[PDB]
Design a protein around this ligand. Structure first.
Ligand SMILES: [Zn+2]
Lengths: 50, 208, 128, 86, 129, 216, 104
RNA sequence: AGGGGAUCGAAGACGAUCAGAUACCGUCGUAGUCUUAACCAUAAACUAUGCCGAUUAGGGAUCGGACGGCGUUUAUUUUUGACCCGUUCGGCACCUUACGAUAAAUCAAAAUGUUUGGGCUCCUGGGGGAGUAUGGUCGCAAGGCUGAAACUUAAAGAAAUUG
């Protein structure tokens, strides 16, 4: 059966570290992420606008 | 009296028409809240409404109707077919917005539905079959007037007119008299003694 | 072999908004759409015209639930004033041999009101 | 009606039901007002003077406003032989 | 079996106020209830009360004027000192500026704010606000 | 951003300015449905978001997450409201939630503990509210005493404008939404308690809607 | 959690009732917790009657139909499809299934 | 311990199914299933809802008693019996609704409780160890009543929602 009895070596499948790798799954961080997105968006636009 | 003069009386002529339309025969099952508007229960059968009581409550209901500045803030409701043509002619003789047929729940609560009106008063033909209309009236601080027989829920109903409420002739005749009385208080009929120039049978239903 | 909402809603708006300008004829209908609409395909354009000709064919004999237009309200309003001269509901004792039938229980109510002067027939109520 | 030195510091003095006397809360959708017009000797309605009644959602929900309306109107002399305390 | 007629009467009154009626019947009559009604009557929390009569316990009928809230009773007759009254008024009263605890003293069945003036004490019977 | 188009009669009338202040709207118990009325007759409103809840909802395709935001507003001088809304992004949720809160705003009565010396500071009476397995009780307090409560329920009281009070809570108080709703209900019912100083009869008047005709 | 307000037996006001034997498996069940079916079936089908009728012993007559009463435990009953599972709200409805008198 | 012992039927023997089948399916069959004279005192002994008393919403059915009434029915008849309409007292239950309650399922009580006190008795304090060990007491025995500790653990559990 190809599912339950993994046939490889368990090697650092840490969801906590992945959260850092991908995106933290917390509401509080997302607001900061949106603020950063707003900050980055303007600088790219102005260069194109200029 | 201290507020009503003596000219507001049943008058013999009106009495024959109202009781000819079979308005004193309705609802074998007696609701407990409509017992005051009962004269005597017939021997081994139906109940009997108090036709005298109708007249005073009818005038009282009329006083409510002629109080709004613009007559456009009065909605008259009916769903069953027997009281649809009569409602439409009421809206024509006076000023009022009418609703016949389906109600489209959300009319009084949703502000993006196309059939959206914000009236200040509601008149209903039957509370049992128009419960949906009353249910929404409970959300926007609007009184309710309705024609009721002796078996009918009376939650959120402020003024109750006792009638047959399910007859062919009865519902039409009552609407006619109410419309006539409103025009009397207004400057239309110009006098309580002169008769009006439309006959009651216009407020009926045609089969095809 | 059945139409969809796109054609039907397009058919619905055109008839409701330009009722006089078109008629039962299928080619005259075919042309008017291409002037008053903005379609990008000949087959869709043809289909909309076809339904309106079917739609107008049935309106001519009785009004339909879906349609509502300015002309309809007043033209109908004209026809709904029928009045019977006899006035059946009017107290019929003066228009036929017999008078009105009531019951003794009702009779007492008139006495309480005092309108006993009015003459009407009274019939007692049997057990069944 | 609080008074530190005779003035009113309360934001607003609410209404009371005419049939039970309970205060009419804010956001109490369900309460309504009834206005009865005043007629003259020959039947016209005089414009601009009017009597007001108030009912609360509490009494409204049971379905007893009708009997309350008879009592209040019969007291103020607007009806005859319509209400009775048996 | 019936063990506190005073509680029975007060319970009937409370029901009407929360349901909104204007009338209550009270089956057993006694001095304590009748005097208890008077203490409210002198403050307007109630209306006119009628006492019927028969050679029996005797019914009472009062009609409710509204403007009345919870009126309870403490079943075990406690002993109150003249100093331990601020504790009881802090215990069961919506606010300080109004409301009344009712006592029984040798000077008659009475309430506080005058027991303080008369410098008396006794036992607790009830309260109303 | 620019001129708003009133969709309701209550909205068109206020824009004209015929009605003096909000209090009368409260007096007549009228439903508000446009958040432009509220911020016109109550500027200087501050808001705070307590927390956003991540919910790993549903399966079969993974879980499609939604986010629920809780916000409350007030002016620290007698007006406070609270609303909750959920959506697919925190930014969308917060903006929509603030609108709901503005609709909910209500007034709060304030009284004196002992003797009255101007500027009421605490509750007139003590009152409680319940919103499911949690009850909150507020009782008056003398001057000088600060607000004694947990951080969550405490924060609301400044926005309502209360200076002195004791608090008490029972049940499972870890459900932040249920706790906040109970406090809101409790503070709301203060105008429903018929104190001795309101027995005096008041006169009934016609509502603003009926006094004058509107504008097309 | 209670699934039925009557516990599925319909007995309130007594200790117990004497049980009975299921007419299919011979299990024992209380007389009130049993599905009962009354049946009035003919001796034979109509097709047989015509052959029976032609060789009539006396004049023209019909052989009398039989009457039966069957009692089932609940587990066997819903395996033979006498009754079947209903919906959460359809459960609390005790009216007999309506029989069409015209069958389309 | 006697009497009685038709029918079913623990234990048990055979026949099948099954890889095995000390069972589910079949044929027999002992104690027992019945009764007389004495023991045992436990059951999902369930409405999983202690007893007495007061107040609170509408309805139609149903059992027993009493009362009032126009009729019908067949009686050595008439009163009475029996059928119909209504009122009332006391029970086994049900339908709609929530002004009320609860976490919810639901409830005319599981209501009248943060605005907390009508009167009285019994029982429980996270899950296991454990209804175990020891002591006492009742019983011919099986057992009943009363009833711990050492030690171990971060969850066990209730109601409802989506798959
Ligand atoms: Zn079976």
């Amino acid at each position: 059966g190809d599912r339950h009895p993994t046939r490889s070596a368990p090697r650092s499948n840490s969801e906590k570290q992945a959260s850092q790798g991908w995106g933290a799954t917390e509401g509080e961080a997302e607001l900061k992420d949106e603020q950063a997105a707003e900050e980055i968006a303007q600088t790219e636009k102005k260069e194109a606008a200029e | 009296p201290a507020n009503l003069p003596s000219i507001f009386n049943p008058t013999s002529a009106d009495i024959e028409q109202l009781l000819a339309a079979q308005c004193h025969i309705g609802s074998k099952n007696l609701n407990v809240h409509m017992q005051p508007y009962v004269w005597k229960t017939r021997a081994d059968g139906v109940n009997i409404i108090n036709l005298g009581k109708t007249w005073e409550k009818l005038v009282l209901a009329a006083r409510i109707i002629v109080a709004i500045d613009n007559p456009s803030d009065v909605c008259v409701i009916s769903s069953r077919p027997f009281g649809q043509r009569a409602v439409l002619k009421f809206a024509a003789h006076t000023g009022a917005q009418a609703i016949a047929g389906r109600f489209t729940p959300g009319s009084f609560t949703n502000y993006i539905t196309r059939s959206f009106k914000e009236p200040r008063l509601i008149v209903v033909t039957d509370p049992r079959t128009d419960a949906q209309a009353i249910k929404e009236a409970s959300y926007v601080n609007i009184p309710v007037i309705a024609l009721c027989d002796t078996d009918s829920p009376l939650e959120y109903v402020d003024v109750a007119i006792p009638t047959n409420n399910k007859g062919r002739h009865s519902v039409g005749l009552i609407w006619w008299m109410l419309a006539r009385e409103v025009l009397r208080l207004r400057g239309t009929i110009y006098n309580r003694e002169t008769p009006w120039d439309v006959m009651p049978d216009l407020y009926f239903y045609r089969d095809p | 072999r059945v139409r969809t909402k796109t054609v039907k809603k397009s058919a619905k708006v055109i008839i409701e908004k330009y009722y006089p300008r078109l008629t039962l004829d299928f080619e005259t209908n075919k042309r008017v759409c291409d002037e008053i609409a903005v379609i990008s395909s000949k087959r869709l354009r043809n289909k909309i015209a076809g339904y309106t000709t079917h739609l107008m064919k049935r309106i001519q004999r009785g009004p339909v639930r879906g349609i509502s237009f300015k002309l309809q309200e007043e033209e109908r309003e004209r026809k709904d004033q029928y009045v019977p001269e006899v006035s059946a509901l009017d107290f019929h004792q003066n228009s036929e041999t017999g008078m009105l039938d009531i019951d003794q229980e009702t009779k007492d109510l008139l006495k309480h009101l005092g309108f006993d002067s009015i003459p009407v027939n009274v019939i007692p109520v049997t057990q069944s | 009606m609080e008074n530190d030195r005779g003035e009113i510091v309360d934001l607003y003095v609410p209404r009371k039901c005419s049939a039970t006397g309970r205060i009419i809360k804010a956001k109490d959708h369900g309460s309504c007002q009834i206005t009865i017009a005043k007629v003259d000797e020959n039947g016209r309605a005089i414009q601009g003077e009017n009597i007001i009644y108030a009912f609360s959602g509490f009494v409204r929900a049971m379905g007893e406003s009708d009997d309350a309306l008879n009592r209040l109107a019969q007291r103020d002399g607007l009806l005859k032989n319509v209400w009775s305390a048996q | 079996v019936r063990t506190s007629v005073l509680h029975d009467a007060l319970n009937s009154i409370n029901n009407a106020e929360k349901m909104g009626k204007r009338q209550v019947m009270i089956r057993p009559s006694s001095k304590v209830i009748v005097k208890f009604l008077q203490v409210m009557q002198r403050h307007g929390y109630i209306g006119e009360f009628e006492e019927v009569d028969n050679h029996r316990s005797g019914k009472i009928v009062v009609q409710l004027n509204g403007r009345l809230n919870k009126c309870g009773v403490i079943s075990p007759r406690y002993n109150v000192r003249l100093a331990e009254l601020e504790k009881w008024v802090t215990k069961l009263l919506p606010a300080r500026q109004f409301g009344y605890v009712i006592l029984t003293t040798s000077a008659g069945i009475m309430d506080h704010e005058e027991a303080r003036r008369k410098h008396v004490a006794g036992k607790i019977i009830g309260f109303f606000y | 951003e620019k001129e708003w188009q009133p969709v309701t009669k209550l909205g068109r009338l206020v824009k004209a300015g015929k009605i003096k202040s909000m209090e009368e709207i409260y007096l007549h118990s009228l439903p508000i449905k446009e958040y432009q009325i509220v911020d016109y007759f109550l500027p200087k409103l501050k808001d705070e978001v307590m927390k956003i809840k991540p919910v790993q909802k549903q399966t079969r395709a993974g879980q499609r997450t939604r986010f629920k935001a809780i916000v409350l507003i007030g002016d620290s001088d007698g007006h406070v409201g609270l609303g909750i809304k959920t959506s697919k992004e925190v930014a969308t949720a917060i903006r929509a939630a603030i609108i709901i809160a503005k609709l909910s705003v209500i007034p709060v009565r304030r009284g004196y503990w002992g003797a009255n010396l101007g500027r009421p500071h605490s509750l007139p009476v003590k009152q409680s509210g319940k919103c499911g397995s949690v009850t909150v009780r507020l009782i008056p307090a003398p001057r000088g005493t600060s607000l004694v409560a947990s951080p969550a329920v405490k924060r609301l009281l400044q926005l309502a404008g209360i200076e002195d009070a004791y608090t008490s809570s029972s049940g499972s108080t870890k459900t932040l939404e249920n706790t906040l709703k109970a406090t809101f209900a409790a503070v709301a019912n203060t105008y429903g308690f018929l104190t001795p100083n309101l027995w005096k009869e008041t006169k009934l008047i016609r509502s603003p809607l009926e006094e004058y005709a509107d504008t097309l | 959690v209670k699934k039925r307000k009557n516990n599925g037996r319909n007995k309130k006001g007594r200790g117990h009732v004497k049980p009975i034997r299921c007419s299919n498996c011979a299990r024992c069940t209380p007389k009130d917790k049993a599905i009962k079916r009354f049946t009035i079936r003919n001796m034979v089908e109509s097709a047989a009657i015509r052959d029976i009728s032609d060789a009539s012993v006396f004049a023209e007559y019909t052989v009398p139909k039989m009457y039966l009463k069957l009692q089932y435990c609940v587990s066997c009953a819903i395996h033979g499809k006498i009754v079947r599972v209903r919906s959460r709200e359809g459960r609390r409805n005790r009216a007999p299934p309506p029989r069409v008198r015209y069958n389309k």
